[PDB]
Amino acid sequence: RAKAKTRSSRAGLQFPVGRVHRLLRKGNYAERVGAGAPVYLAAVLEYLTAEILELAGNAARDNKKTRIIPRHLQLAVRNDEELNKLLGRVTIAQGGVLPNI
Amino acid sequence: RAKAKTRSSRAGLQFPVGRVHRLLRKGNYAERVGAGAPVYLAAVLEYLTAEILELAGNAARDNKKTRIIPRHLQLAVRNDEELNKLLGRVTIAQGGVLPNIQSVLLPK
Amino acid sequence: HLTRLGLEFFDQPAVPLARAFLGQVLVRRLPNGTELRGRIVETEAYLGPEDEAAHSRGGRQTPRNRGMFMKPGTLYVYIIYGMYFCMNISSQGDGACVLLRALEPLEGLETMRQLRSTVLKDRELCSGPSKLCQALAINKSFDQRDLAQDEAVWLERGPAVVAAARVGVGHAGEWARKPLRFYVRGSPWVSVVDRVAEQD
Amino acid sequence: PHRYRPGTVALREIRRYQKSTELLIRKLPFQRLVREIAQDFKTDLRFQSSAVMALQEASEAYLVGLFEDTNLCAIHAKRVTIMPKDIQLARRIRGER
Amino acid sequence: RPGTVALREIRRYQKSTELLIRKLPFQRLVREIAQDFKTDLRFQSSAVMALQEASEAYLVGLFEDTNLCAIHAKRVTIMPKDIQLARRIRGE
Amino acid sequence: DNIQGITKPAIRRLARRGGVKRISGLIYEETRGVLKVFLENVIRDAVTYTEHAKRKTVTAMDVVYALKRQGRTLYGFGG
Amino acid sequence: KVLRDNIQGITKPAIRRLARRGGVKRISGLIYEETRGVLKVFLENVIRDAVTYTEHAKRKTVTAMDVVYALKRQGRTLYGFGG
Amino acid sequence: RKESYAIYVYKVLKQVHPDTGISSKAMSIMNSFVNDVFERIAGEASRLAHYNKRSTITSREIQTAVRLLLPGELAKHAVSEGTKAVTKYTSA
Amino acid sequence: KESYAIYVYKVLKQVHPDTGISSKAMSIMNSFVNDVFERIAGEASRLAHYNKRSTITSREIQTAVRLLLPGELAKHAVSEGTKAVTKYTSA
DNA sequence: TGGAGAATCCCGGTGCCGAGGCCGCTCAATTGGTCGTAGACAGCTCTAGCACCGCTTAAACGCACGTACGCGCTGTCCCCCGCGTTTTAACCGCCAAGGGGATTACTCCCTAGTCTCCAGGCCCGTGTCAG
DNA sequence: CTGACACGGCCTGGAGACTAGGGAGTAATCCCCTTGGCGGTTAAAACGCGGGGGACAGCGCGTACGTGCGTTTAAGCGGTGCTAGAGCTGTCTACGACCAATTGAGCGGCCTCGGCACCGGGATTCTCCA
């Protein structure tokens, strides 16, 4: 056999594209799953996780801490309009609320 | 062979058991579908259809009509609390609203 | 007796210990009075404080990594997971070490066939240092044991060799690709082989 | 002549437009509104007539529910006249932005 | 002055992330409610903590909507009619 | 500028269906903005469903799927 | 074995703490009983759904998954417990 | 061809109201209702089977999906009617 | 039990190297990844059944992302997925 | 309270078009048998859930006082309702012409299935740092 | 000053490679449904105007929450002990997928006639002023 290069590294991603392919297969979503669908879904999930972690790291840096706690995740989600639109119906445990009077 | 008896006819149902089986199998719900699940689901859908249809017929009788129109279905759903709770996010076309005027707007 | 190697045998630097710990018999002395007669097929060598993959990199002076300033050839075990261990011998100089990797036995196959259990091919019978260290039943309580005293395990004299680079220490630093790991040629029981370093 | 008091014609209209099931917005202005909104997304686009009827029924139902919540918001503030702050309150509680 | 301690409590209870209801009365309330649905139930600790997190977030959001209803009627005191108005508009 | 086609008597009639007795003059512009936002939200999803199927026209089932996507299920147009 | 009315365990300072987190400057005296009733309704719905999920799996222990799936049903997803 | 739940809703209507008809728009609304409730129950049963690592939808999954979806009295009557139908299916 | 913990480690080290993360925050991100994956895959299943296909391609995932995600998030997610699919098919 | 303008319902005829019944048939539901595996069933281990005792100790509770605030009352003035009149364009019907949805044949590429192998990721008890 | 988190064998699920068959892409055609314009009748909107009446501001009072302090209490933490049952594994059986032949049930088409919208006159309230 040839060199076993991982399919996640072929797309330049970090998320487990093979795991997304398997979870799409056994999740009973369609009879067959195309080749680029796990790549696209892993890239989209990686981008959304990266944006959440961007704003969470900035929130942790603004409060002078070097470790992301769920309060930072709540401020990161709710301080952006788009992520608050995506996670409007979602409660983050140990997340707190924003200061408004 | 033997005489063909419908799966709905042997469970006392008017709703089709075999069609519900085929819609469960092609609906991508699970890989396998048991025998009693289409019978159970046909009975449940038959009961809910009967519950709306009886109340809609009573509403059609109350408005001196022989046919059931969308207004009768909307009155039947929105006047029963369980069916209004079940269909609370459902818009019936040509349904109108219930006659409901608040007490503070009526004159004295 | 005469078939025992003392502390004067190990008094060489790191790379002669890498050269002179190949093809020699390690006879573990179980309390039942039997023998094992295992021949080692590969070793590893950490030079000391100047090696990035060693445990004493950058002047590390942890109390567990202390067995080098009283005698050379000191037995060492470290926990690696959470139950596994490894076989280490201190070389000459502070921080220099040689790690045992794999061996092959010739008698008492049932002993580590049934003792290693907590699928049983001869190629995977003694491949992996942790389960063979468990096969010799050397726990963390034998870390203070000196190598060539009492009735315990010693070295026995036996009757090509290809050098390969470091594998599994990460793609960083300058000491992660030096060819020093010696393995015998033609042996099919070697766990990690180098197909590009075989032609030299 | 005869002139009705303020409130009689409004309650007559409330009973008239709650007894009926008809659509209230004129169909052609709603069609033109749907066309100019959809031309901001994809140009040279056609529509089924049933699609515009579906959009009109959904929009009318949404506005009737919004005006009911607005009416309760105005009744809550000791008023009978609804104002834009009532609509803004109802949409803020409902979760719309 | 009447109101400044309330304002500092508002300011200090929004920066904190801790759980505002005591744990054991909530645990006993959950077991009392669950008795009517099934007899002799066991509960995990994470189940009761998940219930407390959901309940506290639900009550905080309801009190935000209640405060908007109270400010809408030109007063700063929340009343049960504000809760009922917000609760009907949210669809409950 | 077809938002003025949703006339003031139409907004008054929709408020009459909602049981509203008195209406301020600034209600109509806010109602036009609310209706425009709602129609943009539904029509964008319907156009997206149309472009996925590679068609030039928006059908009733596309609008029904777009409204079911937003939790505003519509009966009577097929399903 | 039989638990009484433990609804009074949600005390008055707990409701005041939750309202001051919400941003409430003044609280009426009749707010508290309405808050007991609202909490009772919410917990009744979520606990009933989670107990249904539990007895479908033929278990006597209500799991964090049962509450998480109940809240995912009720339109309010709870992150942080394995959902 | 297009399949519909038209004749079955008509049969139920003639069974419960033997002198009452139905319009085309009303039949479209009832067909959409049957499709919506069927999709709701089957989606809930699929989620329940995936949560408990079961690859089949049995009568039990539909039973607990009906109990989760429908409000109380409707759920009780629907579960009783489904149990009666499955019992009549197996015994004959 | 499988989780996305090491992948969120890798993304966080790419985007914020002097920043750690707790266990509770990682549980929240694992639940977030599962939730977004379930939303996108369920929408792709719905558009597969609506168009009478039995295949989830990149087009259904693209349209599901465009339906679910709000505006700028949708634009950048479509750009990222398109770059990933073009790079993966280019080799 | 009465009278009168005005809105609303009832009964009688009409004519219309959409529901409701019948029929040919094509497609999907039934019947019978086989075969492979998902899942019921018995049993065991060990996690963890419940029950109980006690000490600090913070938080809940009861009470006293005062003042901020809800709430009713009154004046007033803008602003919307109701109605008549004029302008404006929605709407019904029709032709037509063109785009485009929907169906069909085909031919092709891509994705499921499977066999083998190996490398990423999980499990885990001590080194070192950030609240 | 310490506890949560990171840096250290083996195993199983991803990956390469071959096969093959059917699902989706493409070209072509048929006709149903969309658009657009015109006439023309008219319902419906736009606009102006008068006046009632309701929103809104000011003010006074009475009471009911906030705030503070002392006494009570039971949460919270630590620890122990017992056992229900959660979770896993092994075995085997019966239940559902799958396939081929059969056949009747529902669907498209078509004909027909009876419920329902509509017009209209008279009875019956609705409302507003006097």
**Residue C84 burial (C-beta neighbours within 10 Å; 0-12, 13-18, 19+):** middle
Token pair of H25, please? Answer: 């728009």
Neighbours of A75 (CB within 10 A): 21
Using the Cβ of I66 and the Cβ atoms of chain F, whether some distance falls under 8 Å is answered with: yes
CA distance B15 to D18: 35
- Burial class of residue B44, CB neighbours in 10 A (0-12, 13-18, 19+): buried
Q: How far apart are CA A45 and CA G63, in angstroms?
A: 28
Q: Which residue of A has its CA nearest to E49?
A: A93
CB contact under 8 A, F26 and D83: yes
Alpha carbons I49 and C13: distance in angstroms, whole number: 72
Buried b (16+ CB within 10 A) or exposed e, F6-20: beeebbbbbbbbbbb
Query: Which H helix or E strand runs over F57?
Result: strand F57-58
Q: Are F17 and B74 in contact (CB under 8 A)?
A: no
User: Are chains H and C in touch, 3+ Cβ pairs below 8 Å?
Assistant: no
Q: Which amino acid appears at position G23 of this protein?
A: G
Report how many Cβ contacts below 8 Å link chain F to chain I. 20
The alpha-carbon gap from G52 to the nearest alpha carbon of chain I, in Å, equals 22
Domains and CATH numbers, chain G: 1-83 (1.10.20.10)
Q: Is B93 within 8 Å of D57 when comparing Cβ atoms?
A: yes
The SS3 of residue C86 is coil
Cβ(A84)–Cβ(A59) below 8 Å: no
Class for the domain spanning H6-91: mainly alpha
* Separation in Å, CA I6 to CA G82, I12, I13, I29: 16, 10, 10, 11
> Tokens 């104002």 appear where?
D83
Residue F45's contacts (CB-CB under 8 Å, 6 or more residues apart) are F65, F66, F69, F70, I67
Does F41 contact chain D (CB < 8 Å)?
A: no
Physical contact, I and G (3 or more Cβ pairs within 8 A): yes
* Pairing of the two strands F22-23 and D81-82: parallel
Question: Which helix (H) or strand (E) covers residue E26, if one does?
Answer: helix E23-34
* Distance, CA of D7 to chain centre: 20
Residue from E75, D76, E82 nearest G31 by CA? E82
The single-letter code of the amino acid at G40 is K
What is the C-alpha end-to-end distance of chain A, expressed in Å? 66
**CB hemisphere CA count around G17 (13 angstroms):** 17
Q: Which residue is nearest to nucleotide K95 (CA to C1')?
A: B34
Rounded to 5°, the CA angle C58-I16-I22 comes to 85
Which chain D residue lies closest to E61 (C-alpha atoms)?
D93
Report the distance separating Cα H80 and Cα H25, nearest Å: 31
- Residue C164 · residue C181 · CB < 8 Å: yes
In the structure encoding, which two tokens stand for residue D47, read together? 């529509």
Domain boundaries, chain C: 1-200
Quickly list H helices, chain C: 14-19, 109-115, 129-135
Q: How far is the CA of A7 from the C1' of K16 (A)?
A: 11
User: In a 10 Å sphere around its CB, with 0-12 CB exposed, 13-18 middle and 19+ buried, how is residue I84 labelled?
Assistant: buried
**CB neighbourhood size of A27 (10 A):** 16
CB C167 within 8 A of CB C44: no
Closest CA to H38 of G50, E10, B37, E26: B37
The nucleotides of chain K lying under 7 Å from a protein CB are 4-6, 8-10, 13-17, 23-25, 33-35, 44-46, 51-56, 64-68, 74-76, 84-87, 95-97, 102-108, 115-117, 127-129
Q: Is G57 in contact with H64 (Cβ distance < 8 A)? A: no
| Structural contact between residues H72 and E37, judged by C-beta atoms closer than 8 angstroms | no
Whole-angstrom CA distances from C178 to C45, C97, C196 are: 11, 16, 14
For residue C98, which of C40, C149, C25 has the smallest C-alpha distance?
C40
Query: For residue G26, what are the CA distances in angstroms to C112, E7, G6?
Result: 76, 10, 26
Q: Note whether B70 and B92 are within 8 A (CB).
A: yes
CB atoms within 10 A of CB D78: 9
B44: domain CATH number? 1.10.20.10
Show the 3-state SS of H34-63. HHHHHHHHHHHHHHHHHHCCCCEECHHHHH
What single DSSP character describes residue F25? T
H79 vs B39, B40, E36, G53, CA distance in Å? 12, 8, 19, 16
Among candidate residues F72, F68, H75, the one with its CA nearest the CA of residue G52:
H75
Handedness of CA C86, C87, C90, C91 (dihedral sign): negative
Q: Where are the beta strands (DSSP E) in C16-153?
A: 25-27, 38-46, 75-76, 87-90, 97-104
Tally the domains of chain D. Answer: 1
Distance CA E61, CA A91 (A): 11
Domain of residue A81, residue span: 1-101
Instruction: Tell how strand C25-27 and strand C154-156 pair up.
Output: antiparallel
Cβ contact A71–E57 (<8 Å): no
Domain total for chain B?
Answer: 1
By what technique were these coordinates determined?
Answer: cryo-EM
Chain D residues near any Cβ of chain B (below 8 Å): 7-8, 11, 14-15, 18-21, 54, 57-58, 61, 64, 71, 75, 80
Residue range of the domain that includes E82:
1-92
Q: What are phi and psi of C44, to 5 degrees?
A: -135, 155
What's the CATH superfamily of I5-90?
Answer: Histone, subunit A (1.10.20.10)
* Cα–Cα distance measured from residue D26 to residue G8, given in angstroms and rounded to the nearest whole number: 56
Which positions ≥6 away from A20 have C-beta within 8 Å?
A38, A41, A42, A45, I37
For residue A5, the one-letter residue type is K
CB E70 within 8 Å of CB E82 = yes
3-class SS at E19? coil
The span from the CA of I60 to the CA of F49, in Å, is 10
CA distances for F31 relative to C63, D25, E28, F5, F15, angstroms: 76, 13, 48, 13, 10
Helix (H, G, I), strand (E, B) or coil at D41: coil
For E43, which DSSP code? Answer: E
> Which amino acid residue lies closest to nucleotide K101, measuring CA to C1'?
B1
